[PDB]
Ligand binder design. Sequence first.
Ligand SMILES: Clc1ccc(N(C[C@@H]2CNC[C@H]2Cc2ccccc2)c2ccccc2)cc1
Ligand SMILES: Clc1ccc(N(C[C@@H]2CNC[C@H]2Cc2ccccc2)c2ccccc2)cc1
Ligand SMILES: *[C@@H]1O[C@H](CO)[C@@H](O)[C@H](O)[C@H]1NC(C)=O
Length: 333
Amino acid sequence: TLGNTTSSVILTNYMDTQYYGEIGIGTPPQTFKVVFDTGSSNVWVPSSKCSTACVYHKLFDASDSSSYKHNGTELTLRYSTGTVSGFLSQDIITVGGITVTQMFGEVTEMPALPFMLAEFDGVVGMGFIEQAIGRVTPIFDNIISQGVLKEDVFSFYYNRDSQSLGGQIVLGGSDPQHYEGNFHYINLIKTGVWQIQMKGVSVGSSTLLCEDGCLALVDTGASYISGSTSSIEKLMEALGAKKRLFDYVVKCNEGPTLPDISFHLGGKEYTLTSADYVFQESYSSKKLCTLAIHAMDIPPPTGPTWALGATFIRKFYTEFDRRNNRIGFALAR
Ligand SMILES: Clc1ccc(N(C[C@@H]2CNC[C@H]2Cc2ccccc2)c2ccccc2)cc1
Ligand SMILES: Clc1ccc(N(C[C@@H]2CNC[C@H]2Cc2ccccc2)c2ccccc2)cc1
Ligand SMILES: *[C@@H]1O[C@H](CO)[C@@H](O)[C@H](O)[C@H]1NC(C)=O
């Protein structure tokens, strides 16, 4: 029918690392907490057929759904900690009011890491079919198909942690209340991945990395800003940060004095100040403070690349444009 629709999905912000909203699967709807991930293209939730990370999440019960259509084809999703395994199923999925018949994964095996830490149940991949495992049609392609959206775009707002809004996803447009000024666009290197060309990473007023150009994946599913092990070893050396097992730290008192970090994308320099990347949990010289920048070695074909996750998105309201194959950034509000 008439496409003037702009569906808003409200997100919960858990500790500035997990941003999740709800979806409803089946007849009647079974609700799930999901992360909306531009870095992946498959929809998956835990199955009732799950034996132990599962135990801790909401399980989908096909036997309680009148709209369910069996499939059973094996689904295997590679994560950096191991495999998320299950089988395909088809059901009616509700997201921000829009209902679509979707092929999704009913997960029967999850690695304990990171899933034991997850406040959310499953994943809703906002990526392209080119990266969908089993060539399964992604949710956004199916929403596009309905011809309901105002524009063939979706936007992300991630807040900084009080009864305030954790985040928001607008399907069919952007929310001007959550951004200031106008959007600056960067075309995708190629369709099939939410990845753009990056022309430099600067510490202060000097380009220290990516001087000859590199790739930047705009990943809403990633908690932090990430680079390859070698890029982050060099960047952390420049910042004077020290490696620990899972992160890099600075003495808490040294944190507010850390230089600005800039990402050269399109015609602009996108700047993050120390307040945007330091988890300032204290101001003590006797305590250590974590950085919201990590090393993540993304495997080919997508990698090696940088990934602009929640750390970048909190600063810059992001619009994913499928009609035009571009990403737009505006300063978040
Ligand atoms: Cl810190 C952190 C690091 C990773 C995540 N992820 C996985 C990343 C989010 N998008 C896909 C993947 C990166 C990738 C992109 C392209 C190709 C390969 C990998 C996650 C997301 C949701 C649930 C569980 C994990 C989250 C936080
Ligand atoms: Cl692929 C992948 C995704 C996340 C991790 N994580 C957990 C993430 C790192 N700190 C925030 C947390 C958010 C999260 C929690 C659950 C799911 C997604 C993000 C991890 C890092 C070091 C030690 C243990 C866990 C690891 C691999
Ligand atoms: C499952 O879905 C795939 C989608 O390509 C289809 O080819 C296959 O025949 C389906 N299997 C069953 C048993 O429905």
